[PDB]
Amino acid sequence: EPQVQFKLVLVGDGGTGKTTFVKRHLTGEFEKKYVATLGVEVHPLVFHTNRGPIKFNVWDTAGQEKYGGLRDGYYIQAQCAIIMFDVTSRVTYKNVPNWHRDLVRVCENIPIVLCGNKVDIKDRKVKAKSIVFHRKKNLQYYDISAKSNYNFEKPFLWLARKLIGDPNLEFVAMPALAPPEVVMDPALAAQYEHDLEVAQTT
Ligand SMILES: Nc1nc2c(ncn2[C@@H]2O[C@H](COP(=O)(O)OP(=O)(O)O)[C@@H](O)[C@H]2O)c(=O)[nH]1
Ligand SMILES: [Mg+2]
């Protein structure tokens, strides 16, 4: 018996929280592989479903997105992807179309998730109404906080359901995660859940 394994590319501007987000899955960080000529660290994030074990091999940069773009070797062969931005920084959000363009050019029709990070910070700039454009382009969206573990499993459970072709797939136990470094206020989570429903119903 082989192993069900998927290449996932994690892309987005420098300073958005990619490396902090991938590092929450503790065993993936313990067993990572550094490849210097690609400019990447590959993290084996294993998840446990109702039909069995799955592995997402997550590609995280070495910081080369701050002074340029990524080569075609980073993207080639991906089976899925996560594009991240920071919700307190608008310039990170306005560069999302160009990240989506590179994934489309090299990979064509793969399932892609858009993540808005740092939702624990009180003064938020980019809200739920500005995400509607990307939903009409066929991206899936989640509000994320890497430091408190808020919605960590969401992007991985949607991508597993798409790849396997099963809308009733579930995770039967959670992976060991790095203890929260900040508290996600419960009044801010209740308000942001309401903003998203308003925007995508009405
Ligand atoms: N409060 C808070 N700070 C965050 C969060 N995610 C990232 N940061 C901060 O963002 C900065 C950049 O983080 P890093 O993981 O290196 O991001 P990257 O360059 O995109 O890989 C650091 O100072 C982090 O501590 C988040 O969930 N909450
Ligand atoms: Mg990084």
7: phi then psi, degrees, rounded to nearest 5: -80, 120
| Contact between 169 and 48 (Cβ < 8 Å) | no
Residues 6+ apart with CB under 8 A from 31: 43, 44
Beta bridge partners of 8: 58, 80
> Which residue positions form the known binding site for GTP?
13-20, 31-37, 63, 117-120, 145-147
| Contact between 154 and 142 (Cβ < 8 Å) | yes
73 lines ligand 1 (CB under 6 A): no
Separation CA 58–CA 32 (nearest Å): 9
- The three-class DSSP label of residue 60 is strand
DSSP assignment of the chain: ----EEEEEEE--TTSSHHHHHTTBHHHHHT-EEETTTTEEEEEEEEEETTEEEEEEEEEE-STTSSS---HHHHTT-SEEEEEEETT-HHHHHTHHHHHHHHHHHH-S--EEEEEE-TTSSS--S-GGGGHHHHTTT-EEEE-BTTTTBTTTHHHHHHHHHHHT-TT--EEEPPPBPPPSS---HHHHHHHHHHHHHHTT-
| Contact between 146 and 25 (Cβ < 8 Å) | no
Which resolution, in Å, applies to this structure?
A: 2.5
The minimum-distance atom of ligand 1 relative to the CA of 23 is 15
Residue 16, CA atoms < 13 Å, CB-side half-sphere: 31
Q: Is 13 exposed, middle or buried (0-12, 13-18, 19+ CB in 10 A)?
A: buried
Q: What sign has the CA pseudo-torsion 151, 155, 156, 161?
A: positive
Separation CA 91–CA 24 (nearest Å): 26
Give distance in angstroms: CA of 86 to centre of ligand 2.
13
Query: Tokens 């902090």 map to which residue?
Result: 20
Domain total for the chain? 1
| Contact between 38 and 78 (Cβ < 8 Å) | no
Residues in the chain: 202
| Contact between 85 and 143 (Cβ < 8 Å) | no
> Which residue positions form the known binding site?
13-20, 31-37, 63, 117-120, 145-147
Query: Euclidean distance between the first and final Cα of the chain, in Å?
Result: 48
147 lines ligand 1 (CB under 6 A): yes
CATH number of the domain to which 98 belongs: 3.40.50.300
- The three-class DSSP label of residue 61 is strand
| Contact between 135 and 103 (Cβ < 8 Å) | no
65 lines ligand 1 (CB under 6 A): no
Separation CA 22–CA 10 (nearest Å): 9
According to the entry, how was the structure determined? Answer: X-ray
| Contact between 21 and 98 (Cβ < 8 Å) | no
Residues 6+ apart with CB under 8 A from 73: 38
Opening angle at CA 107, ends 83 and 77, nearest 5: 100
Residues 6+ apart with CB under 8 A from 190: none
Separation CA 156–CA 47 (nearest Å): 9
Q: Show the domain range for 30.
A: 1-202
Q: How many CB atoms are closer than 10 A to CB 129?
A: 12
